[PDB]
Structure formats: C-alpha cells, structure tokens
Subunit: 363 residues, 3 copies
C-alpha cells in the first residue's frame, strides 16, 4: 500500500505556498498597478475576500467534486470537509492533504485572474455570487475532466499545469464578464511574484521532485525568457521601442504558453513556444481586461503547441502509445473548444444570476 | 544513533527562510503602510537593526538558554556561540544547526511585532535596551517553558507554533510599552508576505515534512480564509461595508488564532477557530498598536480553542493519554496566564531600565 | 551509477527559485529606489530584458561552456541547447537539469547587478551587446575556472557561492563601465528580497540538503546580522545616527562577504567576517554605482577571510590535506587578482565593442 515520500511532501507543500503567493499578493499587485488608482483598494479587497471564499468552498465540497471519483464531468460528495480522507492517506507519492492544498491553490489563482480584472466594473456582492456559481459549475467540472480522470483525460488530453483548466477557463469567464498604468513598478513587482510562484505552479504539477519537475522547471525559465524577447522584439518593430509593460506582458505570455506543455516538451520546444506565445500575445492585445489577449490567446497557442512539441522527434517526452501527432492535435483542439464553451455558458449563467439578484454594474 | 533525513533538512531550511521573510520585509511593510509617513524610515531602520541584534543574541547565548537542558524556566550556557554542537548533530530528524536557525527565526518575528508597532514612539537606544532585556528574560524562558521541555510543556500545554511564545508574549510587551493609513497597498503587501511566510511558521513547526506538517498547512489555509470572511461579514454588519484593512486584519486574526492549534485540530476545527478569531479580532480592535487587539485577543482565543478542538471527537489528533478536555482547558488557561504575567513583568523591567538609562520618549 | 536524491532535487529546485527571486524582482527594486525616478522604468525594462537574454544564452551554449569538460579556462560545446544531457542524467546527487537551472540563476543575478547599476547611463542596445560579450568571455570562463574544474579550482581556491564568480566579477565590470534615493521603502523591499533569496544562493551552493547547507544557512543569518550592526555602529560613529540605506547596505555587505566563506567557516568566523565586511563596506562607499564600494570591497574581504577562517583551529571545516593557511591565503589572492584582471579586460572589450557599434552614452 502506497507510502508518502517526505521529499515529495516537502516539495509539494513549498510548491503550494509558491502558488498561493501568485494570488496573494502576485495577481493583486499586477492588476493593482494597471487599474485606475481610485479603484485599487476595492480591487485588493475583492481579490482578498474572493480568495478566502474559494479556499472555503474548496475544503467544504470543491476538492471532493473535482477529485472524487464520479463520472466524466464531476466527482462526488464523499469528501465534504475532507471527511473520509485519513490524515495518513497518500495520493501518488504525497499525503492527500497536500494534494488538497496544492489543487486548491490552482482554483485560487484562476479566480484571482478573473476578479482582479473585473473588480473595477463589478459590484462586490455580484462578484461573490459569480465566483460561487463559476467555481462550482466551471472550475470544478473542467478540473475534474482534465486532472480528475474525467472526459478530457480519458481521451488523452495533454495539459500539464492548466492551459485549459486555469488559463482558457479564466480568460473566457473574464471576456463574457467584460461583454456584459498609474504604478508600473507595482505591475513589475506583481509580474515578478507571479513568475517566481509559477515555478511551484509548473514544477509542482509533476506531484514529485523528479526529472519531470526538473524539466518543467527549466522549460519555465526558457519559455518565459523566450517570450520576453519575442514580445520586446515585436514591440520594438511595431512601436519603435520596448516598454516595461511590454516586458512584463511578454513574461506572462511565455508563462501561460508553457503552462500546458512544460512537463512534456524539450528545451528547444520551450524556446519555440515562448517566442510564438510572446508574439501571439502581442498580436492578441493589439487586435485591464487583457484577460484573454494574453491568457486566452497564449493559453490556446500553448495547448495546441503541446500537441506538437510533446513528440519524441522534437525533443519531447513522447506521445502515449498508439497516438500520432495528428490525433493528439485533434484532442488538444477538442479540449480547447470544450473549455471555451463550458466556461462561457457557465460564466453567462453566473453573471446573469448575479445581475438578476443584486445587479452587476457597481452602484 | 539519530540520523538526519535530507527531506526534513530541505523542508526545515526552506521553512526557516519563509519565517525570516515574515520579518524581513513582511512585518516591516505591514507597519510601514499603517504608521505615519514621517515615521516610516525610522521604523524600517529599527526593525532591521533589532532583527540583526536578535540573530546575534540568539547564536551567542539565546539558543542555548532556550533549548539547552536546564530547569523548568531556562536552559543552560553550554551552547555559547553553538559550542559543543557538532556540525553533524541531529535534533529530531534534522541537523541541529537547522533547528537553531528555525527557532531563531521565531525570536525575530516576535521582536519584529513589538518593534514595528512601537518604533514611532520609542527612542532607538531605548528599543535596543528593551529588546536585549525582553528577549533574554521573556522570550527565552517562555520558549524554554513551552518548547524546551520546561514547566508548561511538562504539564502538557498544547501550542504548536506559538500562540503563547510568540503572540500573547509580544502582545503583552507591546501593550505595557503603549501604556508607558497612508499606504494601504503596502499594508496589503506586508499582510500577503506574512501569510506566505506563515506556512513555514506553522507547517515547519512539525519539524518534518510529514502528515502533521500537511495538516498544519491545510489548517492555515482554512483558518486564515474563515477569519477573513468572519471579520468582513462583521465589518459589513457593523460598518455597512468591508474595507481592505478589515480584510488584511481578518487574515492576521485567523493566522494568529490557528497558530497554537494548527498541528492538533481537524479542518472543521480550523474553520470554527478562523471564524471566531476573525470576529474576536474585530471585537478586539473595536473595544498602530493593535499589538493585542489582534495578536493578544486572537492568541488567547486560539490557545483556549486548541484545548477544545484537539479532541478526537471533534476531528483533532486527540489529547494525550489520561487527559480530558477539561484538564486540557485548565492547562491552556494556566499557560496563557503565566505568559501574560511573565511577559508583562519583564517588559515593565525592560522599559523602565531603558527609561532610567537613556529615556524612553523619542527626543 | 549515480542516482538522484529527491530531497536534494526538491531543495535545489526551491533554491533556484529563490536565486531567480534575487534578480526578479530583488535587484530591480533595490536599484529602483536608489536611481532617479525618471530612470526607473527604463532600468526595470533593461534588467528584465537582459535577464531573459542571459537565460537564453545560458541554455543555448552558456551552461556547456561553463560546466562542460574542457581546459582550465572554458568547457566545450557538446551541450548546445542541452543536447546529449539525458533527462535522467545526475550531477552530484540531483538531476543535471536542476544544476543547469541553479547555475543559470547565478549568471542572471551577476548580470542583474551590473545592468541595474548602469541602466541609467547606458544605451539599451549597448547594454545588450555588452551583456553578450561579458557573459560569454568573462562570466562563463570564471565560472568554469572556479566551479567547472578549471584553473582556480585545480589550485584549490575556496569560493563557496561566488565571491569571485559573482561579486568581484560584477563589481569590476560595473566599475570599468562607470569609468567609460526617491524611494527608500522600495530599496528596503529589494534588500529584503535579496536577503531571503540569498539563502537559496548560499545554502543551495552545497548542492544537497546536508550539514554543509545547514552551516551555510546559519552563517548567512549570522554574517548578515553582524554586518548590519557593524555598518550601523560605524555610521553612528561617523555620522551621528544610523540610516535605512546604511542598514540595508550593511546587510548586503555581510551577505557579499559571507558568500565565498559560508560553507567553510564556523559561526564565530561568520560573526567576524560580517562585522569586518560591514565596516569595510562603509569605508568603501566613503573613500548608484557602489557596484564595488560594497560588492568589490566586501567580495575581496570575504575571499581573503575565507583563507583564514576555513581553518579547523578557528572553527572552520579545515583546509584540504597538505594546505597551510599561508598557502591558502596565497591562492585566495591569486584568485582575486585573476578575476579582477579577467573581468576588467573583458568588460573593457565589451563596452568598447558596444561603443564602436551603437554608441555607449544614452542618446
């Protein structure tokens, strides 16, 4: 019977603290320097309070519905308040309680990405309602489908750290919301914290301190760097000079782009994904609320590119047995489509429910 | 003969860096955004210099007097400058040098909590004198009594990470001192850093990356979140709206409240402790220098509640053999009382000694 | 055949994230609060973009030329884009991919130290050219000589974490460059981040979570603290009062001074090195661009003092067999001299090449 490895326990608990650091204060500071000064305090309050709400919903029923055994779309309710999970229960090579915390940290950053961007224009009570609906009906089922043995995973979708679950999912929610910089040193500080916490996000997704964690770690350094250069070169070409916001945006583009691919590609693939993601991101914001321009566009680019660069011939870990690059590409596309529609429909429902109960537009 | 486990060494060294992060720059930034602008530089200087002083006193004789074998109140002087501690000496499952650093990091945050709050009104030289007296005669004996096999531990007091040693101890010292916000984004940043470093503080108190570290980790996420919501709801009820300072204060209330309990309670207990701590904290600051309103009140609440929620029937790890909830509650109360009086008497002595030598009131 | 230890993998990946944190955003924030307000954005852009460039040059050929087997001055080109390094290859007790990332993080901070200081006065394109020349012809050969089995290591030079490779190397480059505070809370924040990341820098240099990592960890806490006090006392004596910039400068002086010595000396030696480094640093800045006043002076002091305090009789780990303190001192001096000249000559070449291609002085 499975025994926890202390080295993996240690690594995963530290990785969880790093992911929590991405929201508190990472994302808050990032949006904080971008949005209008008069809306900063309110946004920081919303991100903090909704972060708390997510942590609680996660432990009450979130983890159970996302990672319990159920069907292709959701888990079960046998782990309410983590009941029936023995303190010494092991999941993979770490204590299950660590997996609960690590996974909860991902739900938090996903919600932070949406709330930080929409805080300016949405009523507080309407954001709490939306978070509850969307975490429950979109984040949870998609996490289950992708990482909880659901539909997408059962079809062999490759998404190491959340191009779909986190990025495209939050990007679409923010976009439906939108449809319905005074402090650049602060934006830089938030970007830097997002970057450092992201090593916990990407490398921790291996669930162990092995060679895959090491690969994902190096690929994160490489893709982020390649994207910064890619964005900056494009900015210099289109605008005549680079800018700090451009440099920070490029870093996020590469981080988002490498998210689904990091544990599956070679360093060469990471370099190519980073450059393409940096340029696509720039193209994106050209054609806050760039809660798609970057996260959506780069998330899609990253997910598609994972279906290419995971190939052995291109330095990746290799596709599963009996899977050609063509089949994998098709599965990546179907996963992106399902995520976009699922999140969009649920977000619409969430916003509409808030709008019908308390009103969306801030009074 | 005991052998160090590298996984535990790794976890404990990273946890120590996280605790050091709580002071430098966590607490400094927290008070920095709260106190008057004209006093910020001076306060940051005092926190930095006194942090250095504590690190040195700790290695010179602090660790030895707190953790050496002595009597019920203090250790010994056989570990001056860590003499007689072989580099390869193991304490528990890690190298003793790691335990020296981890424990020293706790002395630093405790002193940071007091200095950051009083810097505005106290003379520099008077704070150095006070720190020396209080670290030596209050922090050290209380650490010894609680974690160094002294009086309180010998009576079975439950205090996982320092409700008494750190929180009530610093709260009372700050209060005796008091008796004798221009930058809210900065307060938020300090709160966020305190939060992230606190995982090292609470989970590292297990001394190993096991299921107790995992439990303390999850309980920290849960209590902090429950307290944020608790404080915010109370604020909305009493004041009509939440505020950023309220959200940050709630987070600290839950973090302080869960400190003594984190490695002993179940997640349900963490949720209850967090809510009660958030509300008590709000009540507290209602009826800087809230270096009691929160740390004192929440520290007492947390310590008392540890005597309840540690029970097996309430999802805790269970009280020691032959100990009823009633007996445990009595021991918690006696530990709180002893800490309050011990710190108060020593703080009085420290402040008076400074006042008689250089004068307390800043010139 | 060598097997990776997961505890060491975990420790080294977290230590690498901590070193990356030193540059992004550590050094950027430090210089950010020091330089003129009108130059902050541009400097943050330069540090971010050059950080990206270093990460890419490192993976493309940097790691191979620095750590591949070659001659006394450089490695080889058999590891271009990390080709021929099996994902499961082990170096020491960790996966080689982790060593690539850890070592790359050191190249980044070294370049960050120079760029952050010179950004104000140097043209963007000229800094990119200089970085490429200097990383390639100075950082790489010196890293190889000291940590890649080259000339200095072959002569028994003691430099645990980079007094020569990082500190004196960057100090001289910045000085040749120079030859050719509006936000003190921000300087403090950057200092604090540099401090916390420095535990990854120093303790991670052991390459494993053992007693040497533990020793280096404690020595870092002690030297930093001793230097803060040393600088502050000197400042109080010369200037009548301490200052925040003085406190922060002292911390960096001790951190730099203990860099080459941390894994070789006893705590007493760390205390002595910290005090001497704090005072020397103060003397230094007395007789930004203090990219020598502190890093150069303290780096030299630290390197010389490592040749003294590594001795068993003074509490150190002991010199290698057949090596007297006299011989060691001579080797330390020769290593310092070689680094100063090598970096100076290459920096001159780098700046001149930029000056002849695009012009150095910002337009």
């Amino acid at each position: 019977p499975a025994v926890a490895d202390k080295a993996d326990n240690a690594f995963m608990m530290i990785c969880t603290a790093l992911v929590l650091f991405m929201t508190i204060p990472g994302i808050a500071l990032f949006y904080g320097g971008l949005i209008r000064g008069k809306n900063v305090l309110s946004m920081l309050t919303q991100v903090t309070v909704t972060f708390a709400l997510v942590c609680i919903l996660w432990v009450v029923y979130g983890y159970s519905l996302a990672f319990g055994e159920g069907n292709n779309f959701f888990g079960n309710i046998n782990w309410l308040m983590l009941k029936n999970i023995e303190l010494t229960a092991v999941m993979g090579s770490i204590y299950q309680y660590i997996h609960v915390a690590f996974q909860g940290s991902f739900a938090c950053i996903t919600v932070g990405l949406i709330v930080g961007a929409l805080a300016e224009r949405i009523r507080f009570s309407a954001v709490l309602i939306f978070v509850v609906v969307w975490l429950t009906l979109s984040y949870i089922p998609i996490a289950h489908m992708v990482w909880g043995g659901g539909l997408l995973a059962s079809h062999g979708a490759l998404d190491f750290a959340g191009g779909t679950v986190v990025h495209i999912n939050a990007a679409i929610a923010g976009l439906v919301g939108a449809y319905l910089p005074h402090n650049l040193p602060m934006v830089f500080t938030g970007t830097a914290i997002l970057y450092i916490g992201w090593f916990g996000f990407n490398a921790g997704s291996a669930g162990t301190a092995n060679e895959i964690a090491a690969l994902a770690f190096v690929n994160t350094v490489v893709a982020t760097a390649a994207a910064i250069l890619g964005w900056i070169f494009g900015e210099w070409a289109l605008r005549g000079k680079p800018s700090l916001l451009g440099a920070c945006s490029g870093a996020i583009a590469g981080l988002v782009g490498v998210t689904p691919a990091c544990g599956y590609i070679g360093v060469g693939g990471a370099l190519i994904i980073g450059v393409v993601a940096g340029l696509a991101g720039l193209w994106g914001v050209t054609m806050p609320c760039d809660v798609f321009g970057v996260h959506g566009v780069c998330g899609i680019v990253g997910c598609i590119m994972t279906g290419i660069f995971a190939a052995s011939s291109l330095g990746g870990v290799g596709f599963a047995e009996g899977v050609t690059m063509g089949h994998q590409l098709l599965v990546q596309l179907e996963s992106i489509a399902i995520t976009i529609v699922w999140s969009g429909v649920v977000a619409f429902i969430g916003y509409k429910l808030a709008d019908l109960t308390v009103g969306l537009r801030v009074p």
